[PDB]
Amino acid sequence: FLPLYFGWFLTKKSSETLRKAGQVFLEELGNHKAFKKELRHFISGDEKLELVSYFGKRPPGVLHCTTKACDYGKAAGAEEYAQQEVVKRSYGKAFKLSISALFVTPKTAGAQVVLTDQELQLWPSDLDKPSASEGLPPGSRAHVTLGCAADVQPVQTGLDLLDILQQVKSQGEAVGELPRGKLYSLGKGRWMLSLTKKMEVKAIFTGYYG
Ligand SMILES: [Cl-]
Ligand SMILES: [Cl-]
């Protein structure tokens, strides 16, 4: 049968680099003037919110960028995906993932991945498309999950990214400057840190089993 899901799994060095950059982002963001102002939109609670604790559910080991969730063949289009020539040829193969930004929402915290044309060939085209993936180029959903809220599923991270990229589609001024780049407030608890320099992480395309 098929793996739980295919994707690019970052090396140990790469994962810790991206992970630590994610922690710094949550710490810096939670301290920023603009975020403390929009706490009412980020949280309908009830005085500083520690975002690193908020996104308490983090990936236990190495970070990864998902391509296609298969659930051992139980997912729609799973069989059709794994039997592609490029998928079979790319299995166990080395890739560099380009991180363009870090983003935060009331549900998830993650990193936007800008896939190359070679890597876009590995992105699935199953018919059941998220409606937020429309008007945007394919592979826009590509991401690395950094953290989730208690009752949130990691699948949500992609949905949040697509929802964010619909807003940007463009935009106005940045509301602040962080050491790595410009910070944008997209409203409704949504934040995007556009990196001045895009991070490059090495990863291996393969299949993960439970
Ligand atoms: Cl790690
Ligand atoms: Cl997409």
Author numbering: 164 to 209, 213 to 335, 338 to 378
The authors write:
2′,3′-cyclic nucleotide 3′-phosphodiesterase (CNPase) comprises 4% of total myelin protein in the central nervous system (CNS), being the most abundant CNS non-compact myelin protein4. CNPase consists of an N-terminal polynucleotide kinase-like domain10, a catalytic phosphodiesterase domain11, and a membrane-anchored C-terminal tail, which contains a cysteine residue that undergoes isoprenylation. The catalytic domain enables the rapid hydrolysis of nucleoside 2′,3′-cyclic phosphates to nucleoside 2′-phosphates. The CNPase catalytic site, lying in a groove between two lobes, has pseudo two-fold symmetry and contains two apposing His-X-Thr-X (X denotes a hydrophobic residue) motifs, characteristic for 2H phosphoesterases 113537.
In addition to the catalytic His mutants, near-complete catalytic inactivation is evident also in T232A, T311A, F235A, F235L, and Y168A. While recognizing the caveat that the high KM for these mutants makes kcat rather inaccurate, this implies that the π-π stacking between Phe235 and the nucleotide base is not only required for substrate affinity, but it also may define correct substrate docking into a productive binding mode.
